[PDB]
Motif scaffolding. Structure first.
Motif, PDB file in Angstrom:
ATOM      1  N   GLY A 139       2.556   2.216  -3.037  1.00 47.94           N
ATOM      2  CA  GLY A 139       2.694   2.616  -4.413  1.00 47.94           C
ATOM      3  C   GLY A 139       3.528   1.701  -5.276  1.00 47.94           C
ATOM      4  O   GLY A 139       3.966   2.129  -6.348  1.00 47.94           O
TER       5      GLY A 139
ATOM      6  N   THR B  21       2.682  -0.890  -7.088  1.00 46.17           N
ATOM      7  CA  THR B  21       2.056  -1.164  -8.376  1.00 46.17           C
ATOM      8  C   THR B  21       2.022   0.079  -9.250  1.00 46.17           C
ATOM      9  O   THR B  21       2.300   0.006 -10.450  1.00 46.17           O
TER      10      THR B  21
ATOM     11  N   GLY C  47       0.789  -1.218   0.000  1.00 46.68           N
ATOM     12  CA  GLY C  47       0.000   0.000   0.000  1.00 46.68           C
ATOM     13  C   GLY C  47       0.821   1.267   0.000  1.00 46.68           C
ATOM     14  O   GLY C  47       0.363   2.292   0.514  1.00 46.68           O
TER      15      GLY C  47
HETATM   16  N1  LIG Z   1       1.682   9.071  -7.716  1.00 45.11           N
HETATM   17  C1  LIG Z   1       0.620   8.821  -6.914  1.00 45.11           C
HETATM   18  N2  LIG Z   1      -0.403   9.696  -6.822  1.00 45.11           N
HETATM   19  C2  LIG Z   1      -1.471   9.475  -6.032  1.00 45.11           C
HETATM   20  N3  LIG Z   1      -1.606   8.372  -5.278  1.00 45.11           N
HETATM   21  C3  LIG Z   1      -0.657   7.410  -5.271  1.00 45.11           C
HETATM   22  C4  LIG Z   1       0.536   7.583  -6.109  1.00 45.11           C
HETATM   23  N4  LIG Z   1       1.301   6.498  -5.915  1.00 45.11           N
HETATM   24  C5  LIG Z   1       0.655   5.697  -5.029  1.00 45.11           C
HETATM   25  N5  LIG Z   1      -0.514   6.242  -4.652  1.00 45.11           N
HETATM   26  C6  LIG Z   1      -1.480   5.652  -3.696  1.00 45.11           C
HETATM   27  O1  LIG Z   1      -0.966   4.446  -3.129  1.00 45.11           O
HETATM   28  C7  LIG Z   1      -2.025   3.501  -2.950  1.00 45.11           C
HETATM   29  C8  LIG Z   1      -1.529   2.077  -3.179  1.00 45.11           C
HETATM   30  O2  LIG Z   1      -1.299   1.887  -4.570  1.00 45.11           O
HETATM   31  P1  LIG Z   1      -0.695   0.535  -5.185  1.00 45.11           P
HETATM   32  O3  LIG Z   1       0.804   0.561  -5.076  1.00 45.11           O
HETATM   33  O4  LIG Z   1      -1.344   0.357  -6.532  1.00 45.11           O
HETATM   34  O5  LIG Z   1      -1.205  -0.644  -4.223  1.00 45.11           O
HETATM   35  P2  LIG Z   1      -0.135  -1.640  -3.549  1.00 45.11           P
HETATM   36  O6  LIG Z   1       0.810  -0.729  -2.812  1.00 45.11           O
HETATM   37  O7  LIG Z   1      -0.969  -2.535  -2.664  1.00 45.11           O
HETATM   38  O8  LIG Z   1       0.490  -2.347  -4.722  1.00 45.11           O
HETATM   39  C9  LIG Z   1      -3.136   3.899  -3.911  1.00 45.11           C
HETATM   40  O9  LIG Z   1      -4.399   3.936  -3.242  1.00 45.11           O
HETATM   41  C10 LIG Z   1      -2.768   5.280  -4.406  1.00 45.11           C
HETATM   42  O10 LIG Z   1      -3.803   6.211  -4.085  1.00 45.11           O
END
Ligand SMILES: Nc1ncnc2c1ncn2[C@@H]1O[C@H](COP(=O)(O)OP(=O)(O)O)[C@@H](O)[C@H]1O
Ligand SMILES: Nc1ncnc2c1ncn2[C@@H]1O[C@H](COP(=O)(O)OP(=O)(O)OP(=O)(O)O)[C@@H](O)[C@H]1O
Ligand SMILES: Nc1ncnc2c1ncn2[C@@H]1O[C@H](COP(=O)(O)OP(=O)(O)O)[C@@H](O)[C@H]1O
Ligand SMILES: [Mg+2]
Ligand SMILES: [Mg+2]
Lengths: 127, 467, 477, 188, 467
Positions: free
Chosen positions: B153, B155, B151
């Protein structure tokens, strides 16, 4: 080296041509039994994880299929199983009943009611 | 050639070939199977018997089933038609969009490029991300470890890297998911579809996914990294470009290898890992290099068991990494994105001989000022802001501005930030941070640097918010 | 089929083939498989033969034909290898042609006894101020370089190799050192970049590189150190000097542990077999210094070990510390802080090289060592003086990369530092002063440095002239 | 299972199990003498250098080995018991220890016909009359119908006397042991 | 007799004799080698086969090679003509000075002295080392053991003891270097040649050297301790003299066993060690006793693997020694040298009826104060030395002064550090520690005791510090 089916009983059978009156495709003779594991000779047409049924009414799951023998795990106490018993294929991998007929019923791992409320409806089965 | 299954112990199947034995690592297809079952040979027990690790469930196999020798190792369909298509370890599509039509097939067991097929000069991969390109530049054809992974970022960062690399240098990418949760696998598929790195309509995809599901036998999760390497090696060699290869997760690669080794009946090494841990990792990590034709830059997500950095798994993977990125929960809290820990991130090529003297000096200055601000924060918390000097309040202001400027808006996150994504070149980043360090922008507000592209965008933001 | 000089692979798998035949095969003999690989016959058993394959077991199949070569495992040695890269078996891998060597040496040959050797009496110059002044390395010594991930050990090895060019370009055949670099379980990218770095420094014309990179089967990583040590023993036994750098000797231990476990041997401590100590002592006991009745040659060894999280009391580090004649502890804390080379002079020692140190360096480095030792214990007036001088020296011993120094420049710089000329200079500018002073002395006053080098001592007149030079330059700084 | 008739002397190991199977098979149907003769025959038949070289190579398939052995057995007109035994040893790949099986069955049949191996050790050889009285007395040791199988080795290591082994029974009238006994007891 | 090799695995060779079998421990000669290869028999495997351990490299042995029984165990030359020579496992000179001419050979596998032969005398042997003489006084005729990890001072200490004790020794001496550096053996040889303890051109040599250094196979390291034991046993029993027996390093005798045990088909013990560790150690170590026929004052350097005193090897050796001396790496890191741990070191003659009442009382006072300091150390490390009562601060100061004072400059370390070697007679040691304990020197700086001889030198050093 050595195999578990090289016991002198099997070799004795095979030397004097007594291995042709025994159906070694759908039946087997327990070579060993201990601590809930039976080692069965025969059952050449038995599939991995298939359910076999011992002569004494017990069931078992055939997990280890080796060149010499089949390693069956017994579904209960190995008190009733003795070396030389007869094990028959059931033909089907283990499956359980399913449906809304189970709701409110206590069952064991194989779908048999154990709460003494009567048979279990069981319209459908599932592997 | 045709043999018979003689034994079936769990996921291990012993086959017998009366005519002629297949070499080790070949792939054997079990005939009489409702769904394709492939067995990879691993031993020659003698007496024409071979021992094989199964790539799928062996339940329902019989002693005697016919097994057909393919004649070559697992061969997968490689080409430009794999882009945007999910496919399992043995190459069969699993996204239910029809066959992966290609005129090429590649065996997944290849060898690392010879000593002469090797670039002798280091390089830098410009990803268009300020923090990555400044404090931890990604070497071209070098493994990058990526930490955090919850959680923070991971992904979105992976997707942004895919997009930037397919936009700046035009190379495609592969995403090998080693032991991938099916729920998260589907979620990732849909996130890629939404952001646009996969296009189901026009065939302009930029990523080819290879999923080794978490419920496949140990012999399949151990080889999906090799399938991903094959798909990427096509693009390197045949297409002659720079590819990205995301391996998520690498600890699961080591775990699958360990389970296969145990199943085959081998004595475990130090902490219960396979005795072949170092070579099992090296054979894969040695195919991610910069040949004279193209290059493959890999990004392993890394998990550290028991939070122990000396555990044989990370102790062995860290020997291969050429860089490091550390996403931190403590920085996503601040609203900075990408939440890359500027100080914990590391790189091997952060060397004045490689990245040049100016880049090295800017990076070292930024790191020093950030460390100074980190140290000063304790004084702020304890003795209060008043205690600072005037040559320390200035550093606090400069460090806050630098922290804001290290954040960036991603093109694959325009539905999370309301801004428009920026792909900042390298010269822009170096100039911006050099100017901020010099003090040329001490009169601006801190928030004028938050979530902007090059420095000129910070100037424009300051003008727009002050006027 | 001839079942005496030929056999058939009974069972391949794990990288240990079992062959049936070869009735006349000697133990530890090299056999050749039909496909093209080669193997070594460990276990002469009554009914088969256990051959470890020097390559990938994929190429071997049950039924293949193994033919004995007729000779114990040996590698090609000679002058023909200098400037070439070679795998663990002496087959060139840089694609510059066949190696073409006339002599072959066994890799399992035994180390020289007690009478051939003689005390270490010549210095092995590394061009690293810290190493040359505080932990000198003689010729014939075995000086372990022990550290962590990315702390600058390969940098020490390559600085040594590049520094040997002052002597390998001259005419004195008694000072030329032929380096060997064994790379074990190490990324091939790194080996290629290292070879390019050496070629750019004109340091390949006297360097052999043996490669057993991480993509190479375990037996090759096990056998690479011995191939390198034989390639160096050639020079040792022919009256020439050699320097072999095993890098690392922990990757070799991991490879040997793989080999042993796959053979189902009883794992010991950390799953390492019981032969690991023998594995390494068999190897590091060959770095001898022959006496003039045997040629007078020498073979230095610079094994490299990577501790884990700074643990120096581990199993393999302690084995190799019980085998070697010293230590160079590279500390990760110092390296990250900014001190580079990060040698932890507190824990790094040299058993033997102390007597081999050069007199000119010896006299200055003695007081340097005393001053640093005093500073180490206090980290008012005397305390402030010790802190100041110690910080000056510590910032003086920082060094660049791939820029080794001749002994004369080291003498000049350390002399300036220890005689208190920098006791007023701000601690940050010491590096700038050092770089300017070196250029000054290397440009104008070549006569002084040449006289120091030739006479091999800081004579009183040399002392006075050096005093004048340093004081005048410090005035004009 | 079939209640096999146990052999008199239990031989153990792979050869023991194969030989006990053969003995149980032969004892019913009463073919012990003929099967022993056939075993002695195959003792030489397989020993032929060509056959031995063709049966000790594990790269000739078990199919070819079984076919060759079937051809040899047919060409020799054996009992079905011996033919099946050879087939069974060939299928299981146990040909390299066939002579062990023949030796085991020889040991097992000797006890069947009532023989107790004997050993006599002396410093020097014996006069035939003394050997005759030895035969008589040793037959006195045995039971009814138990033929004797004497072996007279000559061990000069002992200083004289005699040493006799009858099965597991052992009597040591040798000079050396008595010298040892006196020296030890006297030393105490 | 004549047998033929049937198996050759590592250093373990199987030999089949159709004629008479050789007994156990009996030695065989492999016929057809360039040099002499001796195989010591170790087991009878049945089927007229014997397993054996080779006393030299086994490369080049061919299955079917011929082996000739020798009829007796390894017999070595013993006598006064083995003084000043260097021998190896099988008694062959390795100094290149001609065959060792003796009229009397000894089998290296003799049995231990019976119970009616032991001697109960217990004297004190003065070594001139403060820590050794005060807390763990060595005894004449007893066994002494220097336990220590790698690079803590075992060999420096044993060379200091050689120098001191064996310079003031009128009897013979025997150094058996088992599993140590070959250059260390060369340095020892030349130090003795220079120091007059060996005459290459006379018959007044008083040291016999045996060497199984680390470069030799496991079979030679295993059975080289027995060669030194035999050479010393001769000088004890027959010559009826008092012998010194230095062994360095005895761990390599047990270690070598665990190298061959694996190949002898034996189930491994606690940590890969042979099941017969304690029995072999006992049979070796009970031949080094001082019987009524003579005296052996054996000093053995013992290596502690990974600094683990819980290891089976040192833990088993502890029960075979009169005096122990546990060199510690922490103390060596503090700069103290010798690094003897005053609390792990023990002795049998630390009895008021043997050493006295002032010696015993002083030793116990030093140990008590050091133990109190050890108890305080944990709190001192965190809470700081300010949260201590005044009695506790006095204890800390005295304990640090005593710790420093136990350090001493050896003569064998003159080259290392440039100091001057010091011997400290027993009375001076006891007096100095009495004075420190009473508090007579509480006004001096603790660094005035670091590396000095008698205490008056500490006072002189303190005065020089004032200037
Ligand atoms: N550049 C960004 N701008 C806005 N929100 C971000 C950005 N990078 C990450 N996030 C936030 O981080 C959270 C987790 O994203 P993600 O990495 O896709 O899930 P995980 O960490 O479980 O793989 C998302 O809800 C997103 O809102
Ligand atoms: N003297 C030096 N001055 C400045 N930087 C240095 C110096 N020595 C090494 N480095 C830096 O340290 C990094 C790693 O160096 P090096 O490869 O020598 O360490 P290593 O221990 O060999 O690494 P690994 O353990 O990964 O093989 C290099 O990228 C280099 O920039
Ligand atoms: N009396 C001493 N003075 C100074 N240093 C010593 C002394 N005794 C031992 N040492 C230290 O011990 C090291 C040598 O260790 P050594 O005993 O040879 O290793 P091992 O324990 O393997 O025998 C030296 O480098 C030195 O620093
Ligand atoms: Mg390196
Ligand atoms: Mg030592």
């Amino acid at each position: 080296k050595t195999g578990t089916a090289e016991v002198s009983s099997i070799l004795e059978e095979r030397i004097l041509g007594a291995d042709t009156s025994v159906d070694l495709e759908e039946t087997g003779r327990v070579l060993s039994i201990g601590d809930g594991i039976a080692r069965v000779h025969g059952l050449r047409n038995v599939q991995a994880e298939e359910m076999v049924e011992f002569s004494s009414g017990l069931k078992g799951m055939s997990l280890n299929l080796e060149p010499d023998n089949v390693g069956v795990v017994v579904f209960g106490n190995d008190k009733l199983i003795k070396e030389g018993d007869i094990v028959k294929r059931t033909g089907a991998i283990v499956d359980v009943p399913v449906g809304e007929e189970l709701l409110g019923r206590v069952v064991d791992a194989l779908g048999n009611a154990i709460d003494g409320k009567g048979p279990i409806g069981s319209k459908a089965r599932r592997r | 050639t045709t043999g018979r299954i003689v034994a079936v112990i769990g996921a291990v199947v012993d086959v017998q070939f009366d005519e002629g034995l297949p070499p080790i690592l070949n792939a054997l297809e079990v005939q009489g199977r409702e769904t394709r079952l492939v067995l990879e040979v691993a031993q020659h027990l003698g007496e024409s018997t071979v021992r094989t690790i199964a790539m799928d469930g062996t339940e329902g196999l019989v002693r005697g089933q016919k097994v057909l020798d393919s004649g070559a190792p697992i061969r997968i369909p490689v080409g430009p038609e794999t882009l945007g298509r999910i496919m399992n370890v043995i190459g069969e599509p699993i996204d239910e969009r029809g066959p992966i039509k290609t005129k090429q097939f590649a065996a997944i067991h290849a060898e690392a490029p010879e000593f002469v097929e090797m670039s002798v000069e280091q390089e830098i991969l410009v990803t268009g991300i300020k923090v990555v390109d400044l404090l931890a530049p990604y070497a071209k054809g070098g493994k990058i470890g990526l930490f955090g992974g919850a959680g923070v970022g991971k992904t979105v960062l992976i997707m942004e890297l895919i997009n930037n690399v397919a936009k700046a240098h035009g190379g495609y990418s592969v995403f090998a998911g080693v032991g991938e949760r099916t729920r998260e696998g589907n979620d990732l598929y849909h996130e890629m579809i939404e952001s646009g790195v996969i296009n189901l309509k026009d065939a302009t995809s930029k990523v080819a996914l290879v999923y080794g599901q978490m419920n496949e036998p140990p012999g399949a999760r151990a080889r999906v990294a090799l399938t991903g390497l094959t798909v990427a090696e096509y693009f390197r060699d045949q297409e002659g470009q720079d590819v990205l290869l995301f391996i998520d997760n690498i600890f699961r690669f080591t775990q699958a290898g360990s389970e296969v080794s145990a199943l085959l009946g081998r004595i475990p090494s130090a902490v219960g890992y396979q005795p072949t841990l170092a070579t099992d990792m090296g054979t894969m990590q040695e195919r991610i290099t910069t040949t004279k034709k193209g290059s493959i830059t890999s990004v392993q997500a890394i998990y550290v068991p028991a939070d122990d950095l000396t555990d044989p798994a990370p102790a062995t993977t860290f020997a291969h990494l050429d860089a490091t990125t550390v996403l931190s929960r403590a920085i996503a809290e601040l609203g900075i994105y990408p939440a890359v820990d500027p100080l914990d991130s590391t790189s091997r090529i952060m060397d004045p001989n490689i990245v040049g003297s100016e880049h090295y000096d800017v990076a070292r200055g930024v790191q020093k000022i950030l460390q100074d601000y980190k140290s000063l924060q304790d004084i702020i918390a304890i003795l209060g802001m008043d205690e600072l000097s005037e040559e320390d309040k200035l550093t606090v202001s400069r460090a806050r501005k630098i922290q804001r400027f290290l954040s960036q808006p991603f093109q694959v996150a325009e539905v999370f930030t309301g801004h428009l994504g920026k792909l900042v070149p390298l010269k822009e980043t170096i100039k911006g941070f050099q100017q901020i360090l010099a003090g040329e922008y001490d009169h601006l507000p801190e928030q004028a640097f938050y979530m902007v592209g090059p420095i000129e965008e910070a100037v424009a933001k300051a003008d727009k918010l002050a006027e | 089929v001839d079942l005496e000089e030929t056999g058939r692979v009974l069972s391949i798998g794990d990288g240990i083939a079992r062959v049936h035949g070869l009735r006349n095969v000697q133990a530890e003999e090299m056999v050749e498989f039909s496909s093209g690989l080669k193997g070594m016959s460990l276990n002469l058993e009554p009914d088969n033969v256990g051959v470890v394959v020097f390559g990938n077991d994929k190429l071997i199949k049950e039924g293949d034909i193994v033919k004995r070569t007729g000779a114990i495992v040996d590698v090609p040695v000679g002058e023909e290898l200098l400037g070439r890269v070679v795998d663990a078996l002496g087959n060139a891998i840089d694609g510059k042609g066949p190696i073409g060597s006339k002599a072959r040496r066994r890799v399992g040959l035994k180390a020289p006894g007690i009478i051939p050797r003689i005390s270490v009496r010549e210095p092995m110059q590394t061009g690293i101020k810290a190493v040359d002044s505080l932990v000198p390395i003689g010729r014939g010594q075995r000086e372990l370089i022990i550290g962590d991930r990315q702390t600058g050990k390969t940098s020490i090895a390559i600085d040594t190799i590049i520094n040997q060019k002052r002597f390998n370009d001259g005419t004195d055949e008694k000072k030329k050192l032929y380096c060997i670099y064994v790379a074990i379980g190490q990324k091939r990218s790194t080996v290629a970049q290292l070879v390019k770095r050496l070629t750019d420094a004109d340091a390949m014309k006297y360097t052999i590189v043996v490669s057993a990179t991480a993509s190479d089967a375990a037996p090759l990583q096990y056998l690479a150190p011995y191939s390198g040590c034989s390639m160096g023993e050639y020079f040792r036994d022919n009256g020439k000097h050699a320097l072999i750098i095993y890098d690392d000797l922990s990757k070799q231990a991991v490879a040997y542990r793989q080999m042993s476990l796959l053979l189902r041997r009883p794992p010991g401590r950390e799953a390492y077999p019981g032969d690991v100590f023998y594995l390494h002592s068999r190897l590091l006991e060959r770095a001898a210094k022959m006496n003039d009745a045997f040629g007078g040659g020498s073979l230095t060894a610079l094994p490299v070990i990577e501790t884990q999280a700074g643990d120096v009391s581990a199993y393999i580090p302690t084995n190799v510390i019980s085998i070697t004649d010293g230590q160079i502890f590279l500390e990760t804390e110092l390296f990250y802080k900014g001190i580079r080379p990060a040698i932890n002079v507190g824990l790094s020692v040299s058993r033997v090289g102390s007597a081999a140190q050069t007199r000119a360096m010896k006299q200055v480095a003695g007081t340097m060592k005393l001053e640093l030792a005093q500073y180490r214990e206090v980290a008012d007036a005397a305390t402030q003086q010790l802190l100041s001088r110690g910080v000056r020296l510590t910032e003086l011993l920082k060094q660049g990369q791939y820029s080794p120094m001749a002994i004369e420049e080291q003498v000049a710089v350390i002399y300036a530092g220890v005689r208190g000329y920098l006791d007023k200079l701000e601690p940050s500018k010491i590096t700038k002063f050092e770089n300017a002073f070196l250029s000054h002395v290397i440009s104008q006053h070549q006569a002084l440095l040449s006289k120091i080098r030739t006479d091999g001592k800081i004579s009183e007149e040399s002392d006075a002239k050096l005093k004048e030079i340093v004081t005048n330059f410090l005035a004009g700084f | 299972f079939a209640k096999l008739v146990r052999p008199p002397v239990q031989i153990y190991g792979i050869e023991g199990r194969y030989a006990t199977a053969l003995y149980s098979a032969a004892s019913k149907q009463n073919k012990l003498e003929q099967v022993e003769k056939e075993l002695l025959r195959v003792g030489q038949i397989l020993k032929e250098p060509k056959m031995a070289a063709s049966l000790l190579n594990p790269y000739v398939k078990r199919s070819v080995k079984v076919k060759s052995l079937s051809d040899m057995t047919a060409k020799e007109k054996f009992s079905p018991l011996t033919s099946n035994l050879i087939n069974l040893l060939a299928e299981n790949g146990r040909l390299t220890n066939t002579p062990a099986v023949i030796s085991a069955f020889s040991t097992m049949m000797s006890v069947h016909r009532g023989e107790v191996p004997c050993t006599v050790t002396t410093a020097s050889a014996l006069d035939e009359a003394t050997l005759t009285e030895l035969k008589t007395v040793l037959k006195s040791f045995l039971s009814k119908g138990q033929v004797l199988k004497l072996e007279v080795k000559i061990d000069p290591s002992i200083m004289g006397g005699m040493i006799v082994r009858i099965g597991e029974k052992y009597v040591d009238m040798s000079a050396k042991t008595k010298i040892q006994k006196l020296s030890r007891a006297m030393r105490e």
